[PDB]
Nucleic acid binder design. Structure first.
Lengths: 311, 311
DNA sequence: AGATGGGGAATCCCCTAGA
DNA sequence: AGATGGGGAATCCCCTAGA
């Protein structure tokens, strides 16, 4: 028996919320763009076993995995973790209404530590997520009652070590499937699965890329035309304006508009000059596309139409 | 002997700083725009008296005057108040390097109360600024030593009453001139003078109005031409784009460009359509001016050139 | 010296609106 | 019901740079 991901959660787009912002904002969606489908991220317990217990924990997106400080809050959640069971005529368990609680930078340690304590007490992969020496605490711990001084200091040691590295802008979902052993009790899990990274849309570097409106929607094939482009929050240093045309054979033409970090108006507007076309001497016009592109991750905005006309 | 204001402090432009932002940011300037002059707000003790003691206190800009929660911090300051003496061959005392410490909304009461306590203990117009019943405390009080329980509860009563009304975005300067009585001691003040209101530039409604760059710098006399205007932070509902021409006789023509709150792009760009000119049929072009104007206070941005050409 | 700004990030607040 | 966004304000952080 192994656990797998049917549908990943949508990487970019969702917005983590600070405690204050309340709980009524929305749930993290799945990767599917299919029309008329709210699509929630999905997991599947492949190779059918007893009515399993699937849990979700927020882990880091660092080289080495470590528990995250943020909390999953929503429908099936308590103390940062999400718990739901897989019915026999439904080995698939989808997740609807999971929100991501954003901890403040100044409260990262005391929250990271509290999250570790609980998973140690709950046996939720403490060997993996806190310290390899707490491996025995797997599927054990006893709520406060059984967590002793030794484990406590180790939790403090890992927390201190990890809070400094902690990236509050991106998280990963880790599902663990706990199958049943002795009569009733679900205690043996399969290998946990970690999802793709979910980047907070409210983060400067993972913002939504969108060209709101352009000055000119056409330009002379030689380029050089000045266009005032209005867009969503960007960062002068890490932004590009990509012109491109995809030819049926899989080849693609691209030309980048010219502007300086200085031409990027307060993160919401960019003044640039059109790039030269592929071929100058042409008879009928050529429709290409315009879009923002983030150098760093290469994420793009939906394309915008642009018509190139002759010399 | 009466105290007067030679030069008011510049109303808009300065930025109040939160404690954290540090003290090295800058001093509040005067009203003068004269070239090559750093101009600091100025006061004058008219009708020459003994080497007076001029103090500055931050008061509210409400209908009725009340002490403000913010603090004056800078060169000659201690506990929110500014103190400097007027030398005989200099009855004029100018103020250089006064900063305005911005208290948070959540800490307004406990700070307002603390500021009142001190002025009561210092005799700095407590009858005026706190409660008319503490009038006796004028030029008296005795630091903690002499401030008793009665005055204390009155300070708590005024604070609670005033913190709710408190406008953290605008302050006024109140100068009081304390002339000398008995040998040495400066104890009798003239009528205090309150300056114009100083609005925090970091406040949404008193922001700096500036057109950074325009799409088109000219347009047909009939109007209707679409212009992409880049500007400093504005607020869709309270913004106008004013075209105007001043004719030597004092008469002024004005025409406002058309755009909807919706056309205001994320507070940093505005797309509007030019207004019709004054007269259609003309031979040589007419140079008018373009500028942003805030409906509320009518503050304006520096004008921008704009050339109207014929039908 | 000693006088001096500003952009934008991190956090948080409150809107609009259909059965 | 019960599922659901977003704009921008309030606060705060850290840049660049000349003797």
């Amino acid at each position: 028996p192994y656990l797998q991901i049917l549908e990943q959660p949508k990487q970019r787009g969702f917005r983590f919320r600070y405690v204050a912002e309340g709980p009524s904002h929305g749930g993290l969606p799945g990767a599917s763009s299919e029309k008329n489908k709210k699509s929630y991220p999905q997991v599947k317990i492949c190779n059918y076993v007893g009515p399993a217990k699937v849990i979700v924990q927020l882990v880091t997106n660092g080289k080495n995995i470590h528990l995250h400080a943020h909390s999953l809050v929503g429908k099936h959640c308590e103390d940062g973790i999400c718990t739901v069971t897989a019915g026999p005529k439904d080995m698939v368990v989808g997740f609807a209404n999971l929100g991501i609680l954003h901890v403040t930078k100044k409260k990262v340690f005391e929250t990271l530590e509290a999250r570790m304590t609980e998973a140690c007490i709950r046996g939720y992969n403490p060997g993996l997520l806190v310290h390899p020496d707490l491996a025995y605490l797997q599927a054990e711990g006893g709520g406060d009652r059984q967590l002793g001084d030794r484990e406590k200091e180790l939790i403090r040691q890992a927390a201190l070590q990890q809070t400094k590295e902690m990236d509050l802008s991106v998280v990963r979902l880790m599902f663990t499937a706990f199958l049943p052993d002795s009569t009733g009790s679900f205690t043996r899990r399969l290998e946990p699965v970690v999802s793709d990274a979910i980047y907070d849309s409210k983060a400067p570097n993972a913002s939504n890329l969108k060209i709101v409106r352009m000055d000119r929607t056409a330009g002379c094939v030689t380029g050089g035309e000045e266009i005032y482009l209005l867009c969503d929050k960007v960062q002068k240093d890490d932004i590009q304006i990509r012109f491109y045309e995809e030819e049926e054979n899989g080849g693609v033409w691209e030309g980048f508009g010219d502007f300086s970090p200085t031409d990027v108006h307060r993160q919401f507007a960019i003044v640039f000059k059109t790039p030269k076309y592929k071929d100058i001497n042409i008879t009928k016009p050529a429709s290409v596309f315009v879009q923002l592109r983030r150098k760093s991750d290469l994420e793009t905005s939906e394309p915008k139409p642009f018509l190139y006309y002759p010399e």
